[PDB]
């Protein structure tokens, strides 16, 4: 199709052009390199093209051939391609401009050689290594390039071979490299000790870095290489970073543990290194924070790599340096460099040092006789941590599907996890010296007050640090410390000019007090003042203050709730009565979401009320305002659904339901009476909104779902489902859930779901039903059947046309099927056979998704289903099932196992396949599976035929040997998976060795 010149033009249009034409070239190129005959165009491209990018593509094409079809090729072509690639690498090395400027192309050619080595070496290329070593004397460019080759070979054999090769092949190549490494090392060491050319030496050290992943420690400790790494290559600038990476991996070697000589060697390389860094690089006093911000040359990477070396070496070897007093200054200087590195503004570098400091301060806490050696290090460390505390709480502001703006706290984020690590270190350090810690934080605060370090960032940061060490100081020292802090902040607020500045400091006062619940609970009067102050702030319109006030209110009551439900000395009533009574005034200026948070906080307190009559009473009072609104609007609006065309009425109703949701979330089981109060009218409301939504979507189609009208209605609908889901998930009295709640719930939601048009059906209905089945599915076998009848086929129809539409419904559907299958499998036994087939169909369809959230549940259902059937004895549903579906599951499982893109399901795919095989090889299936031949032989036959049909390039010997292994290994998960991995490698290529499947026994 495309001759050389035109290929050159396509490549240059793809890489250097743009827009539509760039895209059209892309398609030409992609088709070209996927052409199975493309590799004959390739040498020609390699011989004649004037375009390094064309040559890259030609090599990719040859890689596909090498990796997949090399053994189809005549031995002639193999040696020809090998001779061609070797000669081409040598030309590129011997051409200076190309060697300078086409390094990606040489690297690619080197990797292509390695792919050939994987096929050919050493069995059909025994002279490769001595030839390579020899050709390194011929040219400094070739020698350097030879180091790249050896580096990539090491990577492809040791670091990346798992899953890219059979277990047997990988072992052979590792043994082969091991046997010839003595000569590779000789070359490598000779270059390190003689070579001048920094680029050659850097390449050599890059290959050494990889060798250290696997070589025996004696190449390191019984040669002179440690001396060279720690002295010579630390002095010259260009080798510093790579040498530290090597020395990091030296520090991780497998070495003898009861050997004085080895210990001295280990101390010596670290001694050499740190001395050389001080002599040639920078003294311990250097400001690395400023050096790193400067970013000169490769300094950032060097400093990152130095942090890694120090923390790696010291985590392993600190006691070694502590064990002799002549090493004390090395010990301390190493720690002092770490202190300087810890000040660099780079979070990932900081975390790396923090992991080490954690190890250190724990060890000082648990062996405090050592503590005197590190006093100065620890003192500087308190300061570093305090100055780098990150925020412990983070909130996401998102717009949901009905267009509402919703705040949610982040959980388990990297930031949050760093806060937690910082805190742990700072807790240890606080106990190690509480006076020092106290002084540091007080004087830090004095420097906010005198203005010398004032800023929003610094006061927030200091507040997070102070708030992190609650429960460290002893109760009385804590009391005095906190009094001092709060007073200092109260003065600071008075002293600062402007509402912005005062709001920041005020928010930090509220933060610190929320973090010291022992201090708060000790004095009711103070606690009560805090709360009343937060209530004042709920009227403050300045940005963020109302959210701060509501967040602190709920945070404090989570911890101090008891104090709100009792009647305190000197008060006439429990404070919860006071809150409830002024609730309208207290919340009048809050946005709705904030009001809901407030109501949630109230419900936390009320759940603390031990007597039921009194708690119900409190609940009733709490809910008086939303119940008043409910009782005046909802029934009326539901009997004439033309009153809900008022967007203002829809809004008011949404907010009532969300108020209930908020209270239910915190009260759970204790919310029952309030739910009961609105339940029947709430379900009539659900029906009326769901009808209107479906009506309009039917008439207007999809775009009706984005309208302000339909969104407001869908909000009511989804909140109702949320309230019922939230209550059922926390219910304690399951009898009432079943006898009073479930039946109305199913009658209202199921038939409506089925009759709605596809674009009006809410996935939240499926979620709600999942919770119902999870919680009380064992108690409602008839309800579970209804659930299936109403939602099964109609949802399957939405999601079985393609893999991409109705993403929420896909996910919730298989979640619901899964729980029904676990908790009420009897519902599946009742289905008629044609619907059961649909169920099996649905399970297999989930297998085919490139969608981890569906796939996982599909696979889990299949496993669970097979166990359910296996638990029915020799009984006819079971035996019918096996005759009908055993092989459907065997081939479906195989189909996704051997697919390119269902790798996340691998573990469960393997388990399912082991279970299916055991059913036959453990003689657990009592019936024949075929229309006195055993099921064992019938299965082996089915499988040979399936495999030779799907993978016709496999030989009979490969199939016999795989199947023989599988059928022997099916009790041993790890070995079983290894065999499956070997199979997945062999199907990707021609001419796999059938003896690979004997790897487990050969062991």
């Amino acid at each position: 199709d495309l001759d050389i010149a035109l290929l050159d033009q396509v490549v240059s249009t793809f890489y250097q052009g743009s827009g539509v034409q760039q895209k059209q070239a892309q398609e030409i190129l992609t088709k070209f390199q996927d052409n199975p005959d493309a590799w004959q165009k390739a040498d020609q491209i390699l011989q004649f093209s004037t375009n390094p990018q064309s040559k890259f593509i030609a090599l990719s094409i040859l890689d596909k051939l090498i990796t997949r079809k090399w053994k189809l090729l005549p031995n002639d072509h193999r040696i020809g391609i090998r001779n061609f690639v070797v000669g081409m690498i040598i030309s590129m090395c011997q051409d200076d401009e190309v060697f300078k400027t086409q390094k990606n192309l040489i690297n690619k050619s080197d990797l292509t050689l390695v792919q050939i080595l994987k096929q050919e070496w050493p069995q059909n290329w025994p002279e490769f290594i001595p030839e390579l070593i020899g050709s390194s004397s011929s040219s400094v460019n070739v020698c350097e390039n030879n180091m790249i080759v050896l580096k990539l070979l090491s990577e492809e054999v040791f670091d990346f071979s798992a899953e890219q090769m059979t277990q047997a092949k990988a072992l052979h190549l590792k043994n082969s490299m091991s046997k010839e490494f003595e000569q590779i090392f000789k070359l490598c060491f000779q270059v390190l000790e003689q070579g001048s050319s920094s680029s050659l030496i850097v390449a050599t050290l890059e290959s050494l870095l990889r060798y250290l992943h696997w070589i025996p420690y004696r190449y390191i400790y019984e040669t002179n290489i440690l001396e060279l790494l720690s002295t010579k290559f630390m002095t010259s600038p260009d080798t510093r970073a790579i040498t530290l990476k090597c020395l990091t991996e030296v520090s991780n070697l497998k070495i003898p543990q009861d050997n004085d000589l080895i210990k001295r060697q280990t101390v010596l390389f670290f001694q050499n290194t740190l001395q050389q860094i001080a002599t040639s690089v920078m003294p311990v006093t250097a400001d690395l924070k400023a050096t790193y911000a400067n970013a000169n040359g490769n300094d950032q990477s060097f400093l990152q790599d130095l942090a890694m070396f120090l923390t790696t070496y010291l985590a392993r070897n600190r006691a070694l340096l502590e064990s002799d007093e002549s090493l004390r200054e090395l010990l301390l200087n190493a720690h002092q460099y770490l202190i300087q590195l810890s000040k660099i503004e780079e979070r990932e570098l900081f975390k790396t040092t923090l992991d080490y400091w954690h190890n250190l301060v724990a060890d000082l806490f648990y062996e405090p006789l050592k503590k005197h050696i590190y006093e100065e290090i620890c003192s500087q460390l308190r300061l570093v941590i305090i100055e780098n505390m990150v925020r412990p709480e983070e909130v996401l502001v998102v717009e949901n599907d009905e267009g509402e703006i919703v705040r949610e706290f982040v959980k388990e984020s990297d930031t949050i996890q760093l806060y937690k690590s910082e805190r742990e270190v700072l807790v240890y350090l606080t106990h190690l010296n509480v006076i020092d810690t106290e002084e540091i934080m007080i004087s830090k605060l004095a420097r906010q007050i005198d203005g010398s370090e004032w800023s929003w960032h610094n006061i927030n940061t200091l507040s997070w640090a102070i708030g992190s060490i609650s429960g460290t100081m002893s109760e009385d020292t804590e009391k005095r410390f906190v009094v001092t802090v709060i007073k200092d902040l109260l003065d600071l607020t008075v002293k600062k000019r402007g509402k912005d500045n005062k709001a920041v400091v005020a928010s930090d006062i509220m933060y610190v007090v929320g973090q010291y619940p022992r201090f708060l609970k000790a004095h009711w009067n103070f606690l009560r003042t805090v709360i009343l102050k937060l209530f004042e702030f709920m009227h403050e319109t300045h940005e963020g203050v109302q959210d701060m006030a509501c967040d602190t209110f709920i945070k404090i009551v989570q911890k101090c709730k008891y104090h709100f439900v009792i009647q305190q000395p000197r008060e006439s009533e429990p404070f919860i009565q006071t809150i409830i009574r002024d609730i309208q005034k207290t919340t009048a200026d809050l946005q709705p979401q904030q009001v809901h948070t407030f109501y949630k906080a109230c419900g936390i307190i009320i759940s603390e009320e031990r007597s039921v009559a009194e708690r119900n009473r409190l609940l009733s009072d709490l809910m008086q305002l939303p119940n008043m609104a409910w009782d005046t609007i909802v029934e009326q609006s539901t009997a004439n659904p033309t009153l809900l065309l008022d967007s203002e009425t829809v809004k008011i109703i949404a907010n009532i339901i969300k108020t209930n949701v908020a209270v239910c979330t915190s009260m759970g089981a204790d919310f029952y009476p309030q739910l009961g109060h609105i339940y029947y009218n709430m379900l009539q409301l659900y029906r009326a909104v769901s009808s209107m939504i479906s009506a309009q979507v039917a008439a207007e189609g999809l775009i009706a779902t984005k309208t302000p009208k339909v969104r407001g209605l869908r909000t009511i609908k989804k909140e109702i489902l949320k309230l019922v889901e939230t209550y059922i998930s926390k219910a304690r009295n399951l009898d009432d859930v079943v006898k009073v709640l479930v039946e109305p719930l199913l009658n209202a939601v199921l038939e409506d779901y089925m009759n709605n048009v596809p674009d009006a059906r809410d996935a939240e209905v499926l979620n709600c039903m999942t919770t119902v089945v999870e919680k009380v599915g064992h108690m409602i076998p008839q309800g579970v059947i209804l659930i299936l009848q109403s939602v099964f086929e109609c949802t399957l129809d939405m999601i079985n046309k393609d893999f991409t539409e109705y993403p929420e419904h896909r996910v919730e559907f298989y979640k619901l099927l899964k729980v029904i299958n676990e908790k009420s499998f009897a519902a599946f036994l009742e289905l008629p056979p044609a619907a059961f087939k649909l169920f099996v169909d649905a399970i297999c369809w989930a297998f085919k998704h490139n969608n981890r959230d569906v796939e996982v549940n599909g696979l889990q259902i299949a496993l669970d289903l097979v166990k359910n059937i296996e638990r029915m004895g020799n009984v006819p549903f079971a035996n019918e099932f096996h005759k009908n579906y055993f092989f459907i599951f065997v081939s479906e499982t195989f189909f996704v196992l051997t697919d390119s893109d269902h790798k996340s399901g691998f573990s469960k795919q393997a388990l399912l396949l082991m279970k299916l095989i055991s059913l036959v090889y453990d003689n657990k299936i009592s019936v024949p599976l075929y229309q006195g031949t055993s099921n064992q032989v019938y299965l082996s036959q089915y499988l040979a035929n399936m495999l030779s049909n799907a993978f016709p390039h496999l030989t009979s010997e490969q199939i016999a040997s795989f199947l023989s292994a599988l059928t022997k290994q099916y009790k041993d998960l790890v070995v079983f998976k290894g065999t499956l991995r070997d199979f997945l490698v062999q199907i990707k290529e021609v001419g796999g060795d059938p003896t690979d499947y004997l790897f487990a026994e050969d062991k």
Binding site: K479, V483, I486, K487, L490, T493, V494, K495, K496, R497, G498, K499, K502, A503, A506, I509, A522, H523, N525, F526, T529, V530, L532, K533, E540, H542, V545
Partner: peptide, 20 residues
Amino acid sequence: GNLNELALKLAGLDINKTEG
């Protein structure tokens, strides 16, 4: 012990004053 001073001071916390 007690926290009577501190509670009274906190009750004075006022982001809208102009004592700067």
